[model samples]
Target: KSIFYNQVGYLISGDKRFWIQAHEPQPFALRTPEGQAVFAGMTKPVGGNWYVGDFTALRVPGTYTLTVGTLEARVVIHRRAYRDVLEAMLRFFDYQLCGVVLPEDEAGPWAHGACHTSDAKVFGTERALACPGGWHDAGDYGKYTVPAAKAVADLLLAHEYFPAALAHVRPMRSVHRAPHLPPALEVAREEIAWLLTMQDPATGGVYHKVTTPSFPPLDTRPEDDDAPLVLSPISYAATATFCAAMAHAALVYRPFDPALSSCCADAARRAYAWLGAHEMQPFHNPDGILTGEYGDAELRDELLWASCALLRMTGDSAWARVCEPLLDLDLPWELGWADVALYGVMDYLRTPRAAVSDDVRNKVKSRLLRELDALAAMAESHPFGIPMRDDDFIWGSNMVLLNRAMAFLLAEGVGVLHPAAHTVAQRAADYLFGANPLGQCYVTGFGQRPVRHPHHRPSVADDVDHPVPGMVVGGPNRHLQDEIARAQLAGRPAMEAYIDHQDSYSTNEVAVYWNSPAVFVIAALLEA
Candidate 1:
């Protein structure tokens, strides 16, 4: 079953064209719930025996069975399919919230005492710190500033791009609610508050992450784990990413909460200044800590990304000059935790008041158009209509498609408004909402066959059969990282390298960075 893009098409796998030719006109028809037969109007061979059925007139919202002789394919139609998915994806954040006591009914065994309350210095001169709050980094209980910053930035940008669509998306399952704050702003504010706490008052540097010596047992719930929450040492990547995120936040929250906006601005500038003064140092996991280091070898792109955000907030020409050297850099297909260079380019292109020349502006736009057009073509070639190549099925494959969708949205914004572009983007969104080869939605609690056993602790520990809603599982990683993944999925193909178990962190773990693109892409589709 595929998305009803005011139309439906089927790409039959093999040489079925001969069979279709034998049965000439009206070879395929859609059987409606009321037993009505809607015949296919056209048939054109695409790749193999791949003849696409044109049913462009079917816009009604209901279940229908597309049949060709004995072959039957079910299709569901709903204009607001993405709108519903978007709200659920946004609500997933509530389940990932740290340092809060959840309501008894909402969470069962996972709902206990506050966790990560006693966080302390892990590396330099150990001491107690009040580093509470923020979403847990992934299925585990660690909270890293770099990925957290990326998540907040993505959500804030999603809100900026689709303000009206995301306006009503609230944290419905959250234990607490800021009645006055806008939903997106409130989510950003919570993460930014924890980020502000990560900034070292003495040196204006930000710690890499707040984690224990090692990950806890998967069976144990968050409230039961009372290990020493360690605040790792500062790194250029973490500090710069945080600076960029907070600076972006300052612009977002300025009108609504002036005091909070000011706080973020001040903190951002200090971190930026401190980063410029210090020698460039990438992160290393300082031996005893077994959590993700999130190390980045090159800090140039990181610095540039921060500069672009600051330029947007402050409109400082110096920041624009800082971006001049990197303007000609090759465009990235998508933005992620480490590769943030393209994010800076995105900001620079959008800022009308920035001091970049028209020549440079045209160059940037042309690069974007070329890459996105190529990406759209790549998406069109996929059987599932997801804008991802086989190699894209990495640790977090769902984000790859979502990020590609984001590129399409950006392309549309910059005057690349081809109907083909819209079609590719829609297909990518459809892929996320249960149109993939697996016939299962990557998101939790959404489609008919959603993920049930994601590698999340709260979900696993809870007595409820269902896990937390709206979290996007890390889908189909061919480069299986965990032992469970290797043992369970030894010779699986790249696109099929997935197992929905609590131990398969390589395939089933949910993270903030993954959900960021899910929010952005779905919101973009809803807008389109």
Candidate 2:
């Protein structure tokens, strides 16, 4: 008697090889060679594990005429080659649904849908939104995606929605063709390098979240020496470096030296593994996989999101495969809203067989067509330049910015016909291009709007006449990206903002991720 087993890429490594398509297994059987006595139950083994190029676990094996209840059959594996398989999946929009997709689907509530939770175990530490009662950042994850990803990954995916969702953004962005940033871009890169050099040269990763740019001279106040300088510790969130690593990989992918490319890709892989190992959960959902509560829940979203954003930067489908199981989240599905789906799927599509599977490629195409139709019908019935919200759900204004920011990075050649692709491009543009004709920018952090301030309680505002139409009022001043950009453009090295916009003048500090995104977006828009 022999028990056969099917092998997946990770089966040997003890990682989950067989993904349960449904919560339960169907009845299966065991039989003899002569089709004689047999037993039936919910368990069955397909075949002996084989080591080879690629494999799919869609089917099972059976003996010559084995019976499973009233039917007789033989198991034959389904063969779906990667050559035609890749193109087929592309026909449909396949990737994490964030940014542009979120805006396109911006017809429902955009708050954190789950109660994030964390565990003490090292390997299975996070119990993502997949589990009941998990926490999520809601709209905050999109910003992290903007910094090191969109521009690079969008090139491969077709159809974009987030771009059009903006209040004042250009249609069909010019990211790939944009002229390279001169003096400042390189300068900023060097500054980043310098900051990395100061990482104690012992711990392989960044120690603290805050650091002064390398170029400009450091200025200290007269009384600062004696005072205890508040050291901004390296946040578990920002340090995840998923998007940063990918962005770096993309930059160096085309490097003149092969060794450099190999090393960069290796670093990206390490960071990706580090983040995945730390955050990956048995289940997934819109909100992040919760690792802990004690206020650490909120901080974890930063790392999880950074991981997704970083993975998106790689542009290697094989690399993106690392996020596949993550996309098929079993959380309560939220339809008519594009945020998480787009963000999740886009990231999923970043690698091989991650987003579109051979079985669902056709379904993906159907979804694209249906969404396109919906967009077209809504175009006439709904208000242009604004979200089509219903009474039960309100697609808040800041979600539009998140959508727009994402749309700004869709695949350049992708059109608005493919539902998946179009959904991505359409919604992204809706926000980025300023769906609001008058041009209104917005931001969404935690509950009660995130304010970008230098002090506590960031004052939230949306008045067009306000200092910054889309700017938040009360968070942290240094948290503001616009301010950071302005300061950077003005030849300044350091800029500051509030941590949560809850503090105005009291708690102020510079945001490293703020500058990080600025570099990518600036270079992206310039390329665009």
Candidate 3:
């Protein structure tokens, strides 16, 4: 609802068709607390009834109100707006930690004891492995490797780009200066510790997920759920993602803990070898296992990501040669659970220590730039400045916007700077903040209209009115994948197809993977 000092915000006319009929100069003014008024300049038209407000020139830090005709909205301009937002976004991880009770000071009434203690013996094997630690994958208690790895990689990527911006929180150690670990690295380390438990020690393969036979009802708390925990089968996607995330973590942790870093690198190498040996071994849930289907139909992108990560970690051309076979492959329009070729391409182009040839690098970079250009065109077409088309408003569409912003940042990170891309990325950030059609922030506890009720059970079952802070809810599923979602959101506009409710899993569920790119964009904005 408000813009930071030197940041852009907008005003929507409320009537979708108002822009077509009323093209006159709209009178917009911003009045400061001291009664001094600064006139707001409005741009011609973006689309819909929305008109852009160029108020970044107003540098005074104070509460102000913007008046357009008879309508008025409050605004706040502060230097630390982006910084505070970045910090709040990263703090969601603290609440998402599993296996132990959270401190009341940090988690309040939502705190509870260790859950799924029986998770160790779920795989029907003679052995029981202790997989007690890790963040829950989403609103559900299930923990899956592929999406978890994506979350880890996105956080690391943010650290790689803007380490200082994300280093606001000090590490939990004696010395808090240069030699000390960054808070982002520490978060990754905590998740990596649990990821290590997911690896099958004997076979060197990674399990797809740790979940129950079926999803539990909404009323059941994690500590009270007596359902049998089971670990799903291994897949190439899981193994490769594990390898990529661990190798990246190995580099991040090398300065803080050399031994742990070595362990991670070795585990990544072993996982990579297993994936290579059993190239065709795709994972499918066995009978009686019913959880989210996270299996990938193809593994080329996973393989590319793993190979590039190993090359960057080891400085060995062997991994680069492994990637050479897929150098000319087509890139996806956007990155997500199924198509992560963009991650591979971005890593291949940006990783400083990677042992890749210029020819391959140029090819990837060229392909990515073309994709960025297409994304820019799409953003230009949307009045809201979010680069999402109607087709992109599928389940988890908020992540699509964040991921598009990420692609813009990645293109900038690799020296393919385009002013339009930066603007589009900033606009996407604004959309997430409060500029969308709904005029509500998709993230919790940060905006005037924050989502109070999410599909997450802990938030619903807990006594507190506030759900866990910093969680980004999934937004706007036009496909209406389920009967409940369809009924709740029937006949609504594509952008307005979301409702904040406990049963609206398609729209309101919070996910780790969704939060990661959001972290990246916020930190990137802070750096900018």
Candidate 4:
């Protein structure tokens, strides 16, 4: 019905394209504002109702209009087409910072004072513990350990792999300490610092989560929602993920901040020691506490991440026996919050080749290649060119697609090249920026058609016309997990099962982990 294209535009030298639905070949043109045709192309039947047109040969840097039949799309080509959006995406982490004031100078209209500042009580006991200074878990005010670990690890990886890509972007600068670090490290340090406070110094186990009894009312602002916070009991997932993240952070921060790096190195050892003594017991919400569980029944993936991270950090072949067997185990190698064996995969592959068994390393590469083949096949067949199917449009589906895109980019660093990697990453960005069946931008503020009413407490209560700029919402939940999604989005096609309503929390919610992979993917594209 329409020419769905990236509303934010594309790189001048990059793969420039647009999508349209047609049964037969259609001609398209990129014209200047004055009606002068600059570039022309024909659409190819990619899959289903998706016909794609390429204007990549047009290398000029300017604004133009793309037209196919009666449809039109505004396009821009520049050296840095994604720089602004990438900054906003990274700044989102700073905006989500807890226990620190967001000043008007850096934060602009979305600025708010320090929030969730009070110390939390132990879940069962009356004892108090100060767990402060991390990003809010999501649209709500909770701080979860398992997901925080994932978010921290992702940002660290971005800094380590694509430093040049992230160097020019700036996050909330004034709020952080002086002698500034790089962009990704500046934002991730808040959560990494906070995660340390959650670990028990005596036992070394990390608490599962810390939040109020339940989510606050929709209109409750972060500081105004003054309910006393409670810290839940520790779990295997939290400790294992914590160990892996701290281990990863240690290596990345070594050159920048030696003191913090040593602290993280020691913390990883203690957390890993705790993991060895415990079973893979999934976390459960205790009495009166009802935040997200972040629970997983199968936790060998978490263990694998922790083990491989240690092996990489220490360069000790003794840790390989533990990591190699886990690599051989039957597990879904992925980069999402759950089933995060891919982080382990990268850590193992990037380890000094002499430390690990070359034979086992080859098997790991083979399996990862097979996984990418399956994802590439999905992209080849899907209308949107994203590595997702109809059933993949569940809750937090944007994270699913972005995570898969990140997997391909990360593999390129380890010599596991795939031809479809860059295309998939760009298409993922296109989809997130409004090149989709719904013509909805999954991000909060950048596109012409951006999300206005996100399921976020600060944005909902702040009385702003737009939500916090750059918050990435969970897109397209086909299961209709909320009342609003079920009532209004029922019987809709999988990719269309999303609403930009505040009450549609299942699909429209914003999260830290969702934006983490986006930061990675967009940085990779810009770097390329």
Candidate 5:
């Protein structure tokens, strides 16, 4: 009965499709706002009473009204349709910057004074450390290590792949280092600077996180949360992920900031040395702490990422001996916060073809192609043409969607080309912007029906009518982890299980890692 499509619009040369729940094929037509018909198409059933009408051939840059069955919808086509949202997505990192004052001139209503400016005490020691100047990890005010690594990697990859597209956006540039970089690198440098602080000069082991004993009440502003900060104990995953991200930062910043790059190179080396001496132990919250744990029992992928990153950073074939075996393990090659094997895979594959074995490189290439095929198959079957199934709609589902799209695009850079790459990227954007069952834009601000009440402290406590712009909410989580979600969203379809209520943290919370891959994918689309 309703037509679902991207409310923000689409690129003129991009794939365009709208979804409807129709069992039989239906005639669809596009009309100018003035009521003249422009194109006609027939719906094709994708699955489960869902159908799609593709009007990709209508490539004119303008607005139109789309009609199918009893539903009429407005749509837009443009050459640079994603550019504005792309800028918003990139600036989101600046909005998340911790320990900095967001000026009213730049951050507008979302501006706030410097926060969490206190020194942190080591978990079981009296030693005080000033671990500041990073992005807040999520809707809560905590700053975590594992997820921060993923976000930094994504921003670095965004700058690496699409510097031209990234250069057009403006972040809150006043606080960045002099002779500034493009938007992505400029934002990521703040976090990389903070990551350098988390390493213990004594042991070279990276602390897992810096947070209060528990998350503050949801209405507390960033500047009002005054509890003492504690640095969580060092662990294997944190050291491994920190090594990988620092290595990546070292490579990225060499041309821009030689001194910072040298520092990162040394930190990465020291973190890797710590990894070699420690066991792959999972991080557990001590008795009094209650912030997000981000625990992972499996650590091979983290090691894989670290080794491959170092291999790329140094172009030393010696590290390949450490990376190749981990890559060959029975591990899920993913670009997620926890499972980061593919980030390792990309680093290894992108290393000088001269540095890696021919047979292993070929195998990595073919296996990556197979993974893209699996995701492409998922896209082809889903009504929204996104690489997700019902059960795949777990917590942070938007990250899942954006990461799958980023995977396809990332593979193409390493020469694992796939025909479905561009299409899936467009489809994922379409779904995220409003092409799903709810007709809701998962981003905090933009589109016709944007998310207004994200589970973010600044958005909630500022008393602003609109939430902070460009933050991507954790989309439909079938697990219903939060109290509000469990009470009201039980038995709903996976894609429709999300609510925009500020208390529905499981479905509506925003995070730096979630927005990071979004920045990558949007930059990719704009570049393509």
Candidate 6:
């Protein structure tokens, strides 16, 4: 609905800062407590053109209630999101990314045939290694991919996904059974080597990720190659984040094994130390007063997540000191939906609204509540099964459906039922029971764009969107778990369901991600 998504002339989602900074000194009118309209003045600063609080002759911050000619608008003097809690939780998220192995090896249909998920390697299938969808069919799986050692360590800081996520990755703990180990651990080692090896020759900060795969070389232009190639800063920052999170994961799951902790610590120390040397862009306007990025910069989220990862690892309140002048990122849960539910529970647990300052705790609680309300409202509308979030006018939803189940678990753990929780749970139950028209209950991922085939009827939501490819099974046992295990062992092509018109299957497809979550979620229900 906004510029970025508009296809053309789309307004940038966080692109308001530039003009606001450039055109400062414009006076706007506001209402006073006496129902009188007053003019507010804004000031222009030289520091990168961004500033907070309109600096105008008519505006001053004193909690004044006012009215303009016929309309009324109230202005608050000090506006800030939950500062401490946001910082604290960011630290935790960073810890997870760098160290915790949340939900590893669930690559759906992506696993290669004749796969094995033995204790030595989770998703012991070739398809798992090749699949790049973050255990989901999302293209951006690279962002979520990390080594098993790191993922397993990060699980302890979590109240929900970590435990289960840990349980899952533990099986893949890089053991070369009888000296015949899988390549995954080697892959992780190479990833770390790539990062540590690329540190600035002089500064030692990692040189971001390699811009292009070596064979093609970044310079070799193929007309067919996709545009908007990932930039190096993104990778550099992300790798740093991975390191920091791993560090925390080590600390959280320290009791599990000292090896996990030591590895995490080494990674964090190198990555964060590198980032510490570089300075952030000035965020405030010219007048030396700092303000939010508001969206113009591409680095904010990555930067915040990276910084947050560091904070979580070291328990260093001093890290927030580094973030202050640049910008005040909101609470981790206030972040978009991928893990908002989890963030909400963790933030609530870390800083209980009832215990901390209103500014710090309430804001986070409110965010969680808002997500709860949205979930409730969604349940009201889509009673059969509630999705994490739908495509909005501006930004499309990034709802990780399986994560929703984990969120549900957290809500239950706290002995609190968000009104929508029951609604969503019922929908989940109904769909699981074959009540939905989609043919099957679980899916690899929800695609906004449907893939359809000409000859056959489009697959419905109830069907698997992507079936495992190439399976000649030796099915002797008919037991449920055995059947599932057989599919895992025999390497049956994953079954894919079609949605409105879209099919999620394609070349190099994997379905273990979806299957793994399906198993986990069903297991939760079974226990319940």
Best by TM-score: 4
What's the candidate order when arranged by decreasing TM-score? 4, 5, 3, 1, 6, 2
Q: For candidate 4, lDDT tens digit of each residue in 345-374?
A: 999999999899999999999988888999
Residue 27 miss distance in model 1 (angstroms): 4.2
- Once fitted onto the true fold, the runs of candidate 4 whose alpha carbons sit more than 4 angstroms away are none
Error of 2 at 522 (Å): 11
Candidate 2, residues 1-528, lDDT tens digits: the string is: 111121101111111111112223445454555665444445322222211111122233323233333544332222221112112111111111111222223212221111112111112223111111100111111112122232223321211222211212222121111333222221222222322321222233332221111111112211111211111222333344333434443444333334434544554445444445453221211132221111123333333334444555554445334343444443221110212234343343333345336554334334434544454454334333112333211212223322333333432222323333333333322222222221211122211122333211111111111111122221112223444433432332111122333222222222222222222222233222
Candidates sorted by lDDT, best first? 5, 4, 3, 1, 6, 2
- The digit string of per-residue lDDT tens for model 5 on 1-528 reads 588888888888888888988879999999999999999989988888788899999988889999998789999999888888888887888888889888999899889999999999999899999999988888998888899999999999999999988887888888787898878888999999998999999999999999999999988999998999999999888899999999999999999898999899999999999998889999999989999999998999999999999999999988888888888887988996999999999999999988889899998888889989999989888878899999999999999999999999999888788999999999889989998889889998888889999999999999889988999999999999999999999989999999999999999999999999999998998885
For 1-528, candidate 1 gives per-residue lDDT tens digits of: 232222222222111111222223336777786788754655555443234555546666666776765566665555554566677778667667788877657554335667777757747665778888888889999989888877998888887888877875666435655455766776767788889999999888999998998988887687877888788898898899989899888988889888889999999999998888997898989878999888888777788788888887887677777776766665353476887776776777767654667777787777777777687677678654556788888988877777777777766665666555656656665555555545556788766667899999888876778888888988889999899889988888787788878899989999988998778876765664
- For every model shown, the clashing-pair count is 1, 118, 0, 0, 0, 82
Task: Pick the winner on TM-score between candidates 2 and 6.
Answer: 6
Model 5 worst lDDT run, 10 consecutive residues: 168-177
What C-alpha lDDT does candidate 4 achieve relative to the native structure? 0.91
lDDT of every predicted structure (CA atoms): 0.74, 0.27, 0.74, 0.91, 0.91, 0.31
Q: Which sections of candidate 2 miss by over 4 Å?
A: 1-208, 211-236, 239-248, 251-253, 256-264, 276-321, 330-344, 347-382, 388-399, 402-405, 408-528
Model 1, residue 363: distance off in Å is: 1.4
Reference-based lDDT, residue 516, model 5: 96
Q: Model 1: runs farther than 4 Å from truth?
A: 1-27, 38-56, 68-74, 104-113, 122-124, 173-177, 330-333, 416-419
Tell me which of candidates 1 and 6 scores higher on lDDT.
1
Q: Which parts of model 5 have CA positions greater than 4 angstroms off?
A: none
TM-score of each: 0.90, 0.36, 0.92, 0.99, 0.98, 0.44
Task: Return whichever of 4 and 6 wins on lDDT.
Answer: 4
Write one digit per residue (lDDT tens) for candidate 6, span 1-528. 000010001011111111123324434344556656555434344233322232224324433432322332233332221121112211212111211222224223221211111111111122211211112111111222222212222223231333332222222232112331122221123233223333333444442222122122212212222322121232333444455445545454455445646766666667666666665432222222121111222344444445545544455656544433222345333222212223323433343233334464345445556666665665455423344332320111111343454455555544445655533543443343222222222222211111222111111211434422111011111121222333332432222112211221221112212222333333343232
